[PDB]
Amino acid sequence: KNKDIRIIPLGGVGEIAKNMYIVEVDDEMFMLDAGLMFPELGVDIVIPDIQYVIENKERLKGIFLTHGHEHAIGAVSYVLEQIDAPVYGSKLTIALVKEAMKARNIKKKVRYYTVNHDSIMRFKNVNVSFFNTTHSIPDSLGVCIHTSYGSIVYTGAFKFDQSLHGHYAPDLKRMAEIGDEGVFALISDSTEAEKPGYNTPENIIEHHMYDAFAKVKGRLIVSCYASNFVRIQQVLNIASQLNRKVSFLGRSLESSFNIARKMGYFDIPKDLLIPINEVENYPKNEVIIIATGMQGEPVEALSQMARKKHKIMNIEEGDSIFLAITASANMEVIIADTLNELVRAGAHIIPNNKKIHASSHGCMEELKMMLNIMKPEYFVPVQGEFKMQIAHAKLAAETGVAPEKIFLVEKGDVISYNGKDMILNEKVQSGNILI
Length: 435
Fold this sequence. Notes:
Layout: E1 5-11, E2 20-25, E3 28-32, E4 46-48, H1 51-55, E5 60-64, H2 70-73, H3 76-82, E6 87-89, H4 91-103, E7 112-114, E8 120-122, E9 127-133, E10 140-147, E11 150-154, H5 172-181, E12 183-189, H6 202-214, E13 220-224, H7 229-241, E14 245-249, H8 251-262, E15 287-291, H9 298-306, E16 320-324, H10 332-344, E17 348-349, H11 364-374, E18 378-382, H12 386-399, E19 413-417, E20 422-427, E21 432-434
Parallel strand pairs: 3-5, 5-6, 6-7, 11-12, 12-18, 13-15, 13-16, 14-15, 16-17
Antiparallel strand pairs: 1-2, 1-19, 2-3, 4-21, 8-9, 9-10, 10-11, 19-20
Helix pairs in contact: 4-8, 5-11, 6-7, 9-10, 11-12
């Protein structure tokens, strides 16, 4: 029988990125996600301060990674330099973590444990199960910690989109079973909680991308995260239909892509991909360049190309730009500055369609669907700035979660439960580590 529960965000509240959520059930502690954030010169990345975990490291039973986005796994190698705990994730997530460990030349012996939606990981106080979620990277998993009070469910990043199948398909039946069995606390993604309706389905997104790219008279540069496999696949498809080759600019894309291709995640025509060095050999209208940072920070790379400071390839008069990111308080200024730089350089920015809502994260109706499936007793909105958390809390109340059981937390807050009351009466060390 479980007695005491603690839920502590170390990153990913008050921001979109660097997600890391500590859950303790009595004397066992679990880290849910371990993301990085790209700085809002003199810092490459920002990771959570894990001093609290270090002070209690003997109780850390595992790091559970939902999906291979940098905002979910970016810190893992740095965490592992301080603590030896097992790393649980999908087969794709695990492969991406290994690649990051290699990239940093880290020799330390890591205990990876591949999990899937059938995995049940048994600990002394709890069992942990998983369910497939839909996101822009395949084989994403939500995490379900079973306690004697009911399940503690962490969604990670997710949306609901019936046009995505295969390794993107959600486990709706398993999710309904979890909700039916009794969810004590839902910890859910707030990124797009301020946006009404549903995300535009990806089949519609791909058709609008086609229309936009077919108008492009010169070169096309697409800026996105290395982990946005959906967008990458769309570009590959459209390139094939438009008789354009595709080239990658940035290592984390070449690496993430090679890994994923070897594992069977991509549908690639022969003769489509070319090395960045061979791009100048084509007419401009026969090339799409997908650009992400060397670190997988796309806008940084765009910014350099716009200012003609990039090492490998720069923007020219008449290039067209497709920016495939939504923005956060942290990235707003660099996006704005980068857009100005592009227009100054004579590039054409492909406009967002007004009818198109493109995100990897559930809008209001998708978050309500998760709330209505899970039927949680307590709700902790995370993965968002405070305004997004508030918007998500409002949705929870609409679905019928008792407003006194919805907790709005900041980094380092401790939500605790003793079997009678849920409280927020303690803080632990938290903050940003600049790398």
